[PDB]
Amino acid sequence: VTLAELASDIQSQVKVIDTYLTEHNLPQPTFAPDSPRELPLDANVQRARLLLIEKAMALSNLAIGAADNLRWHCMNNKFDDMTLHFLARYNIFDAVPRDEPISYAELSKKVGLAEHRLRRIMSMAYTQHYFCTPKPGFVAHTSNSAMAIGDPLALAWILHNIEEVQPWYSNKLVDATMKWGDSIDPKHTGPNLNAKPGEEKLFYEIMEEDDQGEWNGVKGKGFRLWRLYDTDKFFGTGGAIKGTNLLRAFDWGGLGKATVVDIGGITGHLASTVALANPDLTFIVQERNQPWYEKQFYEQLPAELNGRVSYMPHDKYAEQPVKGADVYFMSTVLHKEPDDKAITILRRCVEAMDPNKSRLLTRDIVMDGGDPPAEDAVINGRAINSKEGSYEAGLGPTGVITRLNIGIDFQVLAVVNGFERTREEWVTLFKKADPRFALKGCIQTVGNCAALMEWILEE
């Protein structure tokens, strides 16, 4: 491919998006804080958007060229993370007003970071369109930075990755690999490279046990796990994996009055999203208890649910105490479970299921892609705006959903030696758990990176 080819391709995708926005009188994305934070969920718009990102990344990459790509990458990339690190730890998102500029001098005194250094940090932020400088000596928000205003979930995501995942695990992954090999054992992770025998610590042990700190309402023991919970919530409130996409991937209303057992459901945020939109549904959120868990679970629980979402302490490897429920639901649980452990969990589900009225629903990455809703299956336009060679938009070796899915793969690899799976690998795994399992649906909304898989037991 050439620069010109990429540019033409880009133009084609922009035209699809730009025409949809105009024909529907929808505001255009910009870098201003009042920009829409996403494009319409229309499947044609989203396919075009995913291809556009991919081609624009290819274009900047090609134009930088082979001589400067590795040179500039190892110089600059790491400092985009460092910039966000400063922005979060100094609370700079909240200190810059959303709709008004602020001087470096005033910003410096608000956050306690000297003017010279502040100026330097902000300048790097500008190059990735986080904040801008509208006039000399002044800082203002962009859309990218404004979305973090007042949102500790956004800051949780920054700090979890920069203060835990990267320094403790991913920076050490090479060493981990050479020491223990290609492992599925969560002990074979960065913090244990020099641990004495029997003194290894698991990621989730560190998260729940460390008591030297505090985060967003939880002081002491488990503050890191609470922050990790915030990150989970962050991915549900907006963007590609937004929780409301679950409502489009399965007919929750069709269940009628029914009980959903939410196994490994964190703090029940996703359960609350589904139950808010489906008044006939009861959710049992099953999770390992913590000293602060119930206090936080009920503080977040919307009163409008009238108690339909409740918490039940439960070990996911143990016997399932809720028998004959309509749905047993696991959202992004099994990608941290190697085969033997996932089979244990699945067999616990099977024993509690009534094969003639229970379903097992999982939400997880399907590496090679799920299927779109039936209404989006037929391609009604041109292939250029819908597919990249043989791959659905967003997939293939340079696809942005492919990229994100590898990012998630690497994250669970880093912290627990987890891994993502293809559809065939999911079906193989479930049938090893019980040969009666059948994949009845595998729905991935366009622009999402996860699929909702509907499993049943048939004779």
Footprint on this chain of ligand F56 (rule: CB under 6 A): 228, 231-232, 235, 241, 332, 336, 365, 408, 411-412, 415, 450
The residues, ordered by sequence, that sit 6+ positions from 185 with a Cβ below 8 Å of its Cβ are 417
Cα dihedral sign, 262-263-266-270: negative
- Hey, what amino acid is at 320? Q
Residue 149 binding target from its own copies, ligand F56, none, CB below 5 to 8 Å by type: none
Residue 132 binding target from its own copies, ligand F56, none, CB below 5 to 8 Å by type: its own copies
Cβ closer to ligand F56: 282 or 411? 411
Q: What is the largest CA-CA distance in the chain?
A: 72
DSSP code, position 195: P
What CA dihedral angle connects 108, 113, 118 and 120, to 10 degrees? 160
How far is 122 from 141, CA to CA, in rounded Å?
A: 11
Cβ closer to ligand F56: 246 or 365? 365
Which residue number is nearest to ligand F56 in terms of Cβ?
411
Residue 102 binding target from its own copies, ligand F56, none, CB below 5 to 8 Å by type: none
Q: For Cα atoms 246, 248, 251, give the angle at the middle one, nearest 5 degrees.
A: 90
Cβ closer to its own copies: 84 or 275? 84
Q: For Cα atoms 307, 231, 83, give the angle at the middle one, nearest 5 degrees.
A: 150
- Hey, what amino acid is at 8? S
Residue 415 binding target from its own copies, ligand F56, none, CB below 5 to 8 Å by type: ligand F56
Cβ closer to ligand F56: 142 or 170? 170
Residue 412 binding target from its own copies, ligand F56, none, CB below 5 to 8 Å by type: ligand F56
Closest distance of CB 143 from its own copies, Å: 4
Cβ closer to ligand F56: 204 or 391? 204
Residue 365 binding target from its own copies, ligand F56, none, CB below 5 to 8 Å by type: ligand F56
Closest distance of CB 405 from its own copies, Å: 9
Closest distance of CB 201 from its own copies, Å: 19
Closest distance of CB 89 from its own copies, Å: 5
Closest distance of CB 8 from its own copies, Å: 8
Cβ closer to ligand F56: 98 or 403? 403
The residues, ordered by sequence, that sit 6+ positions from 157 with a Cβ below 8 Å of its Cβ are 230, 231, 234
Cβ closer to its own copies: 4 or 303? 4
The residues, ordered by sequence, that sit 6+ positions from 363 with a Cβ below 8 Å of its Cβ are 246, 249, 329, 330, 331, 332, 450, 451, 452, 453
What token pair was written down for 450?
């996860």
Residue 154 binding target from its own copies, ligand F56, none, CB below 5 to 8 Å by type: its own copies
Closest distance of CB 372 from ligand F56, Å: 18
Count CB atoms within 10 A of the CB of residue 254: 8
What token pair was written down for 122?
């902000």
How far is 233 from 243, CA to CA, in rounded Å?
A: 9
Closest distance of CB 83 from its own copies, Å: 8
Residue 232 binding target from ligand F56, its own copies, none, CB below 5 to 8 Å by type: ligand F56
- What percentage of the chain's residues is helix, strand, coil (to nearest 5)? 50, 15, 35
